[PDB]
């Protein structure tokens, strides 16, 4: 693996609801560079299932347009780690959250990697961004993006 | 203006020679996002003139290819500030350099802005990157990119 920061005592039910992708970082530039880059995904809502799986609603630019997407992250034996199914095993880790303001996560498959700082409101949270940059110093990131409140209220952060 | 960090006692003649754009940051995502983004420029060599102007040799992706470019930054009454001529006055500021290892600069024209961390060798200089991130905390950056030694040895950081 690469990420080695997870949240202890995570209650997944408590991450339900509205989120904003305030910032994103990735191990490779091409993961985040254009609007249609593979990991350029904007989180809209987290919906944990009664069984403790996590449905994710996001927006993604595909074929010159901002498309909705609904994804399932299946629980593992580790509360802070989930699995999306693909041609390749892709792992979601929750690094840190306070439920009410911010949540940091990374997704990972040379191993590749993207992380975001999620926030509850269309506001620049300097404190959440601090924690995001601290978490990222452990990691081989090569691109970082952040969004302003105006963009945060547009579909696909236009 | 926006940038408010310049190097005191700058000797421009001493920045002559080979440089590598190790990292870049900008105030707007669209300034750096694709390979043909307007401020995605890779520095190759600095050539200060006897009169104290600064010629810059760089590479830039334009029309699906990595083109060379030669640019003149004309001196001002301030040693650490130079001017490129365009439809709009565009200002180059030297923030910090030690001549032998690293140099930080910003270019600026809502005012927009891009900065790079230049290094003498195709090596990841953690120390130069520290200084770059410190300088950038004063600034409204929204995209940051960094390159690995393999890319640093390819034209247009391929
Ligand atoms: C607890 C935070 C969980 C957020 C997880 C976001 C995972 C989305 C990854 C989807 C990858 C790109 C989308 C796709 O093309 O399928
Ligand atoms: C002392 C460091 C000076 C480095 C200055 C680099 C200035 C290059 C800016 C050129 C902007 C894009 C190129 C172009 O399209 O003309």
Q: Dump the DSSP string for chain A.
A: -------TT--GGGG-EE-EEEEEEESSGGGTSSTT-TT--EEEEEEE-TTS-EEEEEEEE-SSSEEEEEEEEEE-SSTTEEEE-SSS-EEEEEEEE-SSSEEEEEEE----EEEEEEESSSS--HHHHHHHHHHHHTS---EEEE--HHHHTSGGG-
Return the sign of the alpha-carbon dihedral for residues B9, B14, B17, B23.
negative
Structurally, at CATH architecture level, domain A1-158 sits in Beta Barrel (2.40)
Say if the Cβ atoms of A29 and B145 lie within 8 Å.
Answer: yes
| Residues whose CB falls within 8 Å of the CB of residue B87, separated by 6 or more in sequence, listed in order | none
Q: Which of B19, B22, B84, B86 best tests ligand 2's pocket when mutated (most atoms within 8 Å of CB)?
A: B84
Phi, psi of B46 (to 5 degrees): -105, 130
Tokens of A52: 């403790």
Interior angle at CA B25, CA A104 and CA A3, nearest 5: 30
* The token pair that represents A60 in the structure block: 């993604």
Q: Can you tell me the distance from the alpha carbon of A52 to that of A75, in angstroms, rounded to the nearest whole number?
A: 6
**For ligand 1, mutation pick of A24, A32, A38, A56 (most atoms within 8 Å of CB):** A56
A42 lines ligand 1 (CB under 6 A): no
For residue A113, list its beta bridge partners: A108
Whether B143 and chain A come into contact, CB under 8 Å, resolves to: yes
Partner residue facing B33 (CB), from A34, A144, A146: A34
The ligand placed nearest to the CA atom of residue B19 is 2
The span from the CA of A12 to the CA of A110, in Å, is 30
Q: Which of A25, A17, A13 is nearest to A101 (CA)?
A: A17
Q: How far, in Å, CA of A99 to CA of A12, rounded?
A: 9
SS3 B130: helix
Q: List the structure tokens of A102.
A: 């911010």
Searching chain B, which residue's CA lies closest to the CA of residue A27? B146
Tell me the structure's resolution in angstroms, rounded to a single decimal. 1.9
The approach used to solve this structure was X-ray
Option in B143, B147, B148 nearest A145 (CB): B143
């Amino acid at each position: 693996l690469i990420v080695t920061q997870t949240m202890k005592g995570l209650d997944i039910q408590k991450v339900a609801g509205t989120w904003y992708s305030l910032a994103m970082a990735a191990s490779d530039i091409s993961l985040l560079d254009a609007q249609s880059a593979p990991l350029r995904v904007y989180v809209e809502e987290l919906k944990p299932t009664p069984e403790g799986d996590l449905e994710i609603l996001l927006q993604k630019w595909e074929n010159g347009e901002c498309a909705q997407k609904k994804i399932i992250a299946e629980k593992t034996k580790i509360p802070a780690v989930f699995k999306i199914d693909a041609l390749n095993e892709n792992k979601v880790l929750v690094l840190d959250t306070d439920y009410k303001k911010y949540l940091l996560f990374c997704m990972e498959n040379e191993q590749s990697l993207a992380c975001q700082c999620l926030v509850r409101t269309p506001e620049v949270d300097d404190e959440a961004l601090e924690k995001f940059d601290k978490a990222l110093k452990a990691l081989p990131m090569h691109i970082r993006l952040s969004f302003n409140p105006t963009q945060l209220e547009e579909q696909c952060h236009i």
